[PDB]
Protein backbone atom coordinates (compact mmCIF):
# COMPACT_ATOMS: atom_id res chain seq x y z
CA UNK A 1 0.00 0.00 0.00
CA UNK A 2 2.83 2.44 0.88
CA UNK A 3 6.10 3.47 -0.81
CA UNK A 4 7.90 2.26 2.38
CA UNK A 5 6.48 -1.29 1.81
CA UNK A 6 7.61 -1.29 -1.85
CA UNK A 7 11.18 -0.11 -1.03
CA UNK A 8 11.71 -3.08 1.38
CA UNK A 9 10.88 -5.72 -1.29
CA UNK A 10 13.73 -7.10 -3.39
CA UNK A 11 13.61 -7.28 -7.22
CA UNK A 12 13.55 -11.11 -6.96
CA UNK A 13 10.47 -10.97 -4.67
CA UNK A 14 8.57 -8.57 -6.99
CA UNK A 15 9.20 -10.94 -9.98
CA UNK A 16 7.33 -13.73 -8.05
CA UNK A 17 4.14 -11.59 -7.74
CA UNK A 18 1.15 -12.42 -10.03
CA UNK A 19 0.73 -10.33 -13.25
CA UNK A 20 4.25 -8.80 -12.77
CA UNK A 21 6.29 -8.69 -16.00
CA UNK A 22 9.89 -7.55 -16.70
CA UNK A 23 8.46 -4.31 -18.27
CA UNK A 24 6.42 -3.38 -15.13
CA UNK A 25 9.51 -4.09 -12.95
CA UNK A 26 11.62 -1.68 -15.09
CA UNK A 27 8.83 0.97 -14.79
CA UNK A 28 8.83 0.59 -10.95
CA UNK A 29 12.66 0.97 -10.83
CA UNK A 30 12.71 4.04 -13.12
CA UNK A 31 9.96 5.73 -11.03
CA UNK A 32 11.66 4.87 -7.68
CA UNK A 33 15.01 6.12 -9.08
CA UNK A 34 13.33 9.44 -10.12
CA UNK A 35 12.49 9.92 -6.37
CA UNK A 36 15.98 8.83 -5.14
CA UNK A 37 14.64 5.48 -3.78
CA UNK A 38 15.91 1.94 -4.54
CA UNK A 39 14.41 -1.54 -4.07
CA UNK A 40 15.79 -3.52 -1.06
CA UNK A 41 16.32 -0.65 1.47
Amino acid sequence: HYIGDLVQRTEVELLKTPNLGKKSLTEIKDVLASRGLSLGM
Binding site: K16, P18, N19, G21, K22, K23
Partner: protein, 120 residues
Protein backbone atom coordinates in the same frame (compact mmCIF):
# COMPACT_ATOMS: atom_id res chain seq x y z
CA UNK B 1 5.37 -28.88 -63.75
CA UNK B 2 1.65 -29.83 -63.46
CA UNK B 3 1.52 -30.96 -67.15
CA UNK B 4 4.57 -33.22 -66.46
CA UNK B 5 2.49 -34.80 -63.61
CA UNK B 6 3.75 -32.98 -60.45
CA UNK B 7 0.86 -32.14 -58.07
CA UNK B 8 2.53 -31.87 -54.60
CA UNK B 9 5.56 -30.12 -53.01
CA UNK B 10 6.61 -33.57 -51.66
CA UNK B 11 6.89 -35.04 -55.20
CA UNK B 12 9.10 -32.08 -56.25
CA UNK B 13 11.22 -32.41 -53.04
CA UNK B 14 11.79 -36.22 -53.13
CA UNK B 15 11.37 -37.54 -56.76
CA UNK B 16 14.60 -38.88 -58.43
CA UNK B 17 16.61 -36.03 -60.09
CA UNK B 18 16.47 -37.95 -63.43
CA UNK B 19 12.66 -37.51 -63.75
CA UNK B 20 12.91 -33.73 -63.12
CA UNK B 21 15.79 -33.52 -65.68
CA UNK B 22 13.57 -35.19 -68.36
CA UNK B 23 11.32 -32.05 -68.32
CA UNK B 24 12.10 -29.77 -71.29
CA UNK B 25 13.91 -26.58 -70.09
CA UNK B 26 15.14 -27.90 -66.69
CA UNK B 27 18.92 -27.95 -66.12
CA UNK B 28 20.73 -29.61 -63.15
CA UNK B 29 21.22 -26.21 -61.33
CA UNK B 30 17.50 -25.28 -61.76
CA UNK B 31 16.34 -28.75 -60.56
CA UNK B 32 18.62 -28.44 -57.48
CA UNK B 33 17.24 -24.93 -56.76
CA UNK B 34 13.62 -26.17 -57.26
CA UNK B 35 14.23 -29.11 -54.83
CA UNK B 36 15.87 -26.80 -52.26
CA UNK B 37 12.87 -24.40 -52.52
CA UNK B 38 10.40 -27.32 -52.23
CA UNK B 39 12.25 -28.66 -49.11
CA UNK B 40 12.39 -25.14 -47.61
CA UNK B 41 8.66 -24.65 -48.37
CA UNK B 42 7.82 -28.04 -46.74
CA UNK B 43 10.03 -27.12 -43.72
CA UNK B 44 8.43 -23.62 -43.39
CA UNK B 45 4.82 -25.01 -43.65
CA UNK B 46 5.54 -27.61 -40.90
CA UNK B 47 7.21 -25.01 -38.58
CA UNK B 48 4.35 -22.48 -39.13
CA UNK B 49 1.61 -25.03 -38.19
CA UNK B 50 3.72 -26.34 -35.24
CA UNK B 51 3.99 -22.74 -33.87
CA UNK B 52 0.30 -21.85 -34.59
CA UNK B 53 -0.90 -24.89 -32.55
CA UNK B 54 1.17 -27.22 -30.29
CA UNK B 55 2.56 -29.80 -32.76
CA UNK B 56 6.38 -29.41 -32.35
CA UNK B 57 7.57 -25.75 -32.07
CA UNK B 58 5.18 -24.78 -29.19
CA UNK B 59 5.19 -28.44 -27.98
CA UNK B 60 8.92 -27.91 -27.13
CA UNK B 61 9.49 -24.11 -26.72
CA UNK B 62 6.22 -23.01 -24.99
CA UNK B 63 6.02 -26.47 -23.27
CA UNK B 64 9.56 -26.12 -21.75
CA UNK B 65 8.01 -24.60 -18.56
CA UNK B 66 7.43 -27.63 -16.24
CA UNK B 67 3.65 -28.26 -16.03
CA UNK B 68 2.77 -27.41 -19.65
CA UNK B 69 0.70 -30.20 -21.21
CA UNK B 70 0.33 -30.34 -25.01
CA UNK B 71 -3.26 -28.91 -24.76
CA UNK B 72 -2.10 -25.89 -22.69
CA UNK B 73 0.83 -25.29 -25.10
CA UNK B 74 -1.66 -25.12 -28.03
CA UNK B 75 -3.98 -22.80 -25.99
CA UNK B 76 -0.95 -20.52 -25.28
CA UNK B 77 0.12 -20.59 -28.96
CA UNK B 78 -3.48 -19.66 -30.01
CA UNK B 79 -2.87 -16.40 -27.98
CA UNK B 80 0.47 -15.84 -29.81
CA UNK B 81 2.60 -17.25 -26.90
CA UNK B 82 4.63 -19.63 -29.09
CA UNK B 83 8.02 -19.72 -27.24
CA UNK B 84 9.31 -20.02 -23.65
CA UNK B 85 10.45 -16.34 -23.98
CA UNK B 86 6.90 -15.25 -25.01
CA UNK B 87 5.58 -16.97 -21.82
CA UNK B 88 8.30 -15.32 -19.64
CA UNK B 89 7.09 -11.88 -20.92
CA UNK B 90 3.40 -12.49 -19.96
CA UNK B 91 1.54 -11.25 -16.88
CA UNK B 92 -0.92 -13.47 -14.92
CA UNK B 93 -3.66 -11.10 -16.22
CA UNK B 94 -2.74 -11.89 -19.90
CA UNK B 95 -3.32 -15.66 -19.32
CA UNK B 96 -6.35 -15.48 -16.92
CA UNK B 97 -8.89 -16.35 -19.70
CA UNK B 98 -7.21 -19.70 -20.64
CA UNK B 99 -9.59 -22.55 -19.72
CA UNK B 100 -7.86 -24.84 -17.13
CA UNK B 101 -5.20 -22.24 -16.10
CA UNK B 102 -5.64 -20.90 -12.54
CA UNK B 103 -3.86 -17.63 -11.51
CA UNK B 104 -1.55 -19.73 -9.26
CA UNK B 105 -0.71 -22.18 -12.10
CA UNK B 106 -0.21 -19.24 -14.55
CA UNK B 107 2.11 -17.56 -11.99
CA UNK B 108 4.09 -20.81 -11.48
CA UNK B 109 4.53 -21.37 -15.27
CA UNK B 110 5.58 -17.71 -15.93
CA UNK B 111 8.12 -17.99 -13.05
CA UNK B 112 9.43 -21.34 -14.39
CA UNK B 113 9.77 -19.77 -17.88
CA UNK B 114 11.59 -16.69 -16.40
CA UNK B 115 13.93 -18.95 -14.37
CA UNK B 116 14.99 -20.75 -17.58
CA UNK B 117 15.12 -17.70 -19.96
CA UNK B 118 16.52 -15.00 -17.61
CA UNK B 119 18.42 -16.98 -14.92
CA UNK B 120 19.60 -20.17 -16.79
Amino acid sequence: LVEEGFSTLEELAYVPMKELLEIEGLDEPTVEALRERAKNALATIAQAQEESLGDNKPADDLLNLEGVDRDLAFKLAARGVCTLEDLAEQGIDDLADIEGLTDEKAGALIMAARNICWFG
